Design a binder for this molecule. Structure first.
Ligand code: MMA
Ligand code: MMA
Ligand code: MMA
Ligand code: MMA
Ligand code: CA
Ligand code: CA
Ligand code: CA
Ligand code: CA
Ligand code: CA
Ligand code: CA
Ligand code: CA
Ligand code: CA
Lengths: 113, 113, 113, 113
């Protein structure tokens, strides 16, 4: 199945947070309606936090893309709703051979405020 | 039910990341085996990222507590495993009356590296 | 937080499946827009399957209620989305003192077909 | 990533429940330590419940395979833990072209009793 693709509520602001656990530099792009809207990059094996950016969901079509060594990483993803209110969309990724799926971890959350 | 309580693998390094969406200052405490082992404080309504800390799980008994206004916030939590490998333990919290459950969001993840 | 309450897409058919793991007889009622729409009951400690019923979500306001020994059980719940398509809303419940939260397990899924 | 593969506690009894939403007959196989240990077959587009079977996890290595039309279906999966106690491992699957991922839905849960 496709992974890293989520349908958000339309026209909502959401946060994107990235953690890295890799020796290879990670490059994360968030697409909204097939257009690039947020970029992150970094490297480190200590759950290193690349920060959070807030962007708008447009029609709702959000895709997470993660590249390392020039290749798009293998993605795994899920969406969780807590208390019928807090939404988290999570992406793990694998850039190599050890199948740890933590090389970049991308977390989307909404609503904010 | 109790919320914000997780059993991790023993003696594992794990990351704790905190996001806030609040006007009241948030205080997050992470306990390992009932001992206070990580703290975060901050405020802001736009998904303010308070960073990530890496700590060890001890016997495995990890608990998240969140306060604001000198009072414990109401917690909701779940654990997710992706690719049979990437673990996320998520806590949402409510400090007030609007039931948005985003006032502090605490993410635990393992394994690292 | 309230547990066992989910917002479904409006006017959608969804399935409700119940498993029991209890010595006490379990009584499950599913409410849609505050009206009773599906009932299940049974007893057994072997993950005993009470079957599946398909009902309609109305405005979308769905609540799971679980009673044993005349008392509403303590609920825990979450919603999961897989492949940006398959939705599962899960409720565990505790009727007693052992905190196993399996006494009735209620699974909602959509879309069908 | 591999999907439908889960590590359970060793030597634990767990339940497997299958729902189908398909016009093609579904065949679900559960492997424990690479040995074929539970089977289900059925068909129907209205969330047809094929029942629950209880089996033992052996060393803990559990795999779900789903076929229809003599071919392995595309799998998507996650594991959820509620109340730090109730485990659900969920598999959705697609046998065709409509990408609804509900053709067989396989739910594993533990602990029982
Ligand atoms: C050297 O190992 C690390 O870096 C590689 C990328 O080179 C990752 O895939 C792996 O999981 C480790 O984090
Ligand atoms: C003023 O409203 C904000 O701040 C309060 C107190 O932190 C939160 O409960 C609420 O959800 C908003 O984020
Ligand atoms: C006797 O123990 C069982 O039944 C009680 C209800 O009596 C449940 O709470 C418990 O988890 C067991 O399933
Ligand atoms: C005819 O359409 C149905 O049957 C096929 C084959 O099982 C499924 O892929 C599809 O989602 C529908 O449930
Ligand atoms: Ca890796
Ligand atoms: Ca890694
Ligand atoms: Ca709030
Ligand atoms: Ca808030
Ligand atoms: Ca119980
Ligand atoms: Ca029980
Ligand atoms: Ca299909
Ligand atoms: Ca189908």
């Amino acid at each position: 199945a496709q992974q890293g693709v989520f349908t958000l509520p339309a026209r909502i602001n959401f946060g994107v947070t990235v953690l890295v656990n890799s020796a290879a530099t990670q490059h994360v792009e968030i697409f909204v309606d097939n257009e690039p809207r947020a970029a992150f990059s970094g490297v480190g094996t200590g759950d290193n936090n690349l920060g959070t950016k807030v962007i708008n969901s447009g029609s709702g079509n959000v895709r997470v893309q993660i590249t390392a060594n020039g290749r798009q990483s293998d993605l795994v993803s899920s969406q969780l709703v807590l208390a019928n209110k807090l939404n988290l969309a999570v992406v793990g990724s694998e850039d190599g051979t050890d199948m740890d799926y933590n090389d970049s971890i991308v977390i989307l959350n909404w609503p904010l405020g």
